[PDB]
Amino acid sequence: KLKQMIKNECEKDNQLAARLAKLAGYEKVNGFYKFVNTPEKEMENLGGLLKIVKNLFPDSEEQLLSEYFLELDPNKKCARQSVEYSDINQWDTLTDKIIINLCNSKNSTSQEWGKVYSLHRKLNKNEISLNDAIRESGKCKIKSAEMLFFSNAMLMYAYLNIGEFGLMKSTSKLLEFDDLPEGFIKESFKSRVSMLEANISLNENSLLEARQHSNRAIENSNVNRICFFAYLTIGNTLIFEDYDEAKKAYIKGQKYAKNPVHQEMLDGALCFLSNIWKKENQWVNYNSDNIKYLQLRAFYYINQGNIEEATEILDELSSRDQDENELGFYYYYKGLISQDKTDYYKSIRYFKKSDDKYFIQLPLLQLERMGADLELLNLISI
Amino acid sequence: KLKQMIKNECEKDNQLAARLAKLAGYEKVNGFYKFVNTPEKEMENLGGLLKIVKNLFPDSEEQLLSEYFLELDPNKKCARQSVEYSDINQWDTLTDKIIINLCNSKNSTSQEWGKVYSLHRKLNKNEISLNDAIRESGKCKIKSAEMLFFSNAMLMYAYLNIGEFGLMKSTSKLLEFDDLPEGFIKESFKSRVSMLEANISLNENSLLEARQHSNRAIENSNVNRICFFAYLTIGNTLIFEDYDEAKKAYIKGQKYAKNPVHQEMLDGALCFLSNIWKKENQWVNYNSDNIKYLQLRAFYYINQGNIEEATEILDELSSRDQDENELGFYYYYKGLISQDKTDYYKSIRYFKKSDDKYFIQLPLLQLERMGADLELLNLISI
Incomplete structure (x- = not known):
């Protein structure tokens, strides 16, 4: 159990136990251990726990959380948070399993999240039409603010996939972040929209705007995918201005690349850069x-x-x-x-x-x- | 009453009655008379009536037909044809009245037509969003081919209003003309989509395609607005190539310019054209x-x-x-x-x-x- 593994790491290092307990909001390590040892079905919010797991097991969070998320109560908020965290990390297998659990749930909010994210995933795989996704989104009778947000924000990825930047922009103009309560989900959505608008701005040769959105995404997110594509975008905005600074941003993206696909994207960015500036090309x-x-x-x-x-x-x-x-x-x-x-x-x-x-x-x-x-x-x- | 007005024109001119019978698609004049004497509630298909009214009373066409359409049986085909003719002429008041009658109809097909055209008019008035219209169209229980066509074609107008020519294109790729039988409806839809496609071609500066779409619209329409803007489009595409051909297109558009706005547009086009080729023409x-x-x-x-x-x-x-x-x-x-x-x-x-x-x-x-x-x-x- 992830619960016991956190405590075991913290029991070997008093300063680590103190700093992780403090990060979770606890002054005494015992309350922190009680918090992380909460049974999965009784967890109320994933945010703090996700911070602890990312701090403690950065290279194995997909596996540990792949086991942990499947134990959450599908009828409650933790499972919905889990589907958003899984999908933003592009943990597609886990994401689809969680979507099944949310759809089979008895709770209408969980079913709604499962149906909206199911549409999102069908759009990712091009298994549904965009207008079919709009109609099916209409049939879901979406009630929660979050999904009311995401059923629109998800359209931006498809529009990006077909290069319809205008319809991206207009879509983002309908996203009212004030309709979203503060918390984990709203910050996740903020990072998503930040990256999308960053690529929009780069495509229009608006470099300062793209850097603004990328830096804001980095400031609001510790998700490896978000930060990787953020530093990738910054480096891309620096391609024709400064070799050393572009290369420095690209290299800053390295610690966030956790699979060979992102690694070859980064290597390709550095290869294009060094080819452009006729510098030593290792990539x-x-x-x-x-x-x-x-x-x-x-x-x-x-x-x-x-x-x-x-x-x-x-x-x-x-x-x-x-x-x-x-x-x-x-x-x-x-x-x-x-x-x-x-x-x-x-x-x-x-x-x-x-x-x-x-x-x-x-x-x-x-x-x-x-x-x-x-x-x-x-x-x-x- | 429109029935007696046609007979009055034919009462003293047997040759006029014969050429009007030919125009309405009748071999013998007595079939034409039996058609013209049909009570509005007993009408099944508008047939050649529109050609007869346009030929006899072109300058009163809106008024007369406005009284005639409202007397038709809303459950029958001629009512649906009437809503299309009214809308393509942009007789908005009459159109909305016919839409109310079709929605309050007891015939399933008529109700479907009324719902689709109601959404189309809400899109014209900017009273519904595009995605809302897609969803509600998903709710309209659309079964007929025509409406299956029109529910898509109507989106092209909305995409045109927001300058999204890409989606326009994609939308026009979903139109199944082969599902439409020959007749008034298919001709009218062909003129609509042909004008829209002409707009797409103009936006991408495809002059040949713009001209061909304009010609298709002309071949399938006798509406003054559509034919006028089609010939204006053709002449506009010919401005920098051939003076005589552009002027010929404009002059063909002359006969369809019945309101001062179109006439002023055409005179301005001819003046601009003579100015481009530095030909002396009077102001x-x-x-x-x-x-x-x-x-x-x-x-x-x-x-x-x-x-x-x-x-x-x-x-x-x-x-x-x-x-x-x-x-x-x-x-x-x-x-x-x-x-x-x-x-x-x-x-x-x-x-x-x-x-x-x-x-x-x-x-x-x-x-x-x-x-x-x-x-x-x-x-x-x-």
Whole structure:
């Protein structure tokens, strides 16, 4: 039991027991041990316990909490908190198990949370239509403020998945945080919306706004996923300004990457950065046929003059299903090889079609080096 | 009563009765008369009545039919046809009355039509949110193909009002025209969606597609508003290509401009077109100081050589509340006078802020003749 494991760690270190008891709000370690040893069905709120678990077992919280959450009473608030914490961490297996428990519950609020998060997950897997999710959300007769919030906030992820940034923005304008009571759920939702708006701002080349939202997410959250994508976003906002500061933010994201997917995203960010600034690149991915990491490897080859290998990778990519943004990068690299302006023109057209107001400067800058009118280039960028 | 009015026109002219019988789809005049003598409560299908009324009393069509539609049996097909005809003509009062009659009907299909059109009108009046309309449409028990079509098509209007052209597109991908039988309803829906698709094509600056959608709408509609705006769209797409073809489209739109607003739009379009191609045409005088009329006045002065009076009009407009698009035109004309590239840059920026991918050609064309790089200018236009 997680309860006894917390006490056993604290009994071996008096200062650790005192600081963790103080973090949970206790002056005496005995009341703290009683709190953490509360039977799972009798737990009232997860917030403090989640703080203790994250402080004590940072590398094993998914497993311990995977066992702990499944013992909560599905009819009560702790289980709903558990589904939100599980989903924000992207613990999909646990999240779906908890969703089943919440749906099979006798309590209407738990059933409502289970149905809304079930719709959220079906949208994540593209197993339901967005309008079908709106209608099904209408059939749930959503009563609680939280779910009234989340049944709308969840739409932002799908709109992001289809690149409908406008409908993201409008959706976020309907989110009234004042309708939410203070506590764990409201802070979690705050971190979510902070990250979403951070990526919205970065996509519009509003760097200060993106940094604001990212920093606020870091300040309100200790969830590894949130902080990882926050430092990833900050570093992304620094790509064309300062190599050392961008790299420093990226590296700050390292301690928050807990799976190889986020690790390869971070390595890819540093690989793109060092390719951009022609710095020492330790992050070339040689064990991937992912479109983006193949693109980054071809970029590295181009910088090192290995044009045949880069052109081989790009030839393989031409038969892959690259989306329009990936095609903007793709024709940027083809232009780096060919030095033909039409490739930079096509790169620009694909960055425009993907509504990317940030990385479109890649070909533009290259057009600027080749002696293009800087005013015309500035008109193209917007 | 509309029945006797038709017979009175045909009473003394057997040839008129024969061509009206042909127009209504009857081989023999006596079938036409039996149709026209049908009591409103006994009407099953509007058939050729709409063509007859439009041909005999085009200038009273709204009034007469308003008394006629309200006497129809709400349980029958001609009532649903009537709600569509009234709404596509934008006879809002009549439309809402028919919607009340359809909702209070005892026929399941009529109730469904009344509910769907009620949601559509609530969306027109901004009395319901888009997601609320999606949900309530989920509650409307929609079974008929037509309404299954219209419940989706009506969303395209709402998405158009918020400038969400992507969702528009996706929504139009869900329309099953094959589920609609031939007849008035399918023709009307085709005109609706064709105009909407024309708006999508204009937003993406797809001129050929815009023209083809406009032609489809023309082929499926005899409503003056739809045909007028379709020909206006065609002429607008032909402005920078062929003077004679654009003018031919506008002139075709002349016969459908029955209210002074449309007529003023068309005269302004012809004047603008002659100004673009620097052809001497005589000014149609209106009693207005609206922004676009004064802008046309300054343009005509610029082309006629009266540069000082054009500067006077532009000085007058500088104190007026010019829109961002209108500011694009404004600084375009100021560029024509000043020959300063900065005026054309401001015009470009205001056309981009107003999301105008078409008339942004005005400063671009001027920058091109001043020796600007053409491909860069093409990149500015997208």
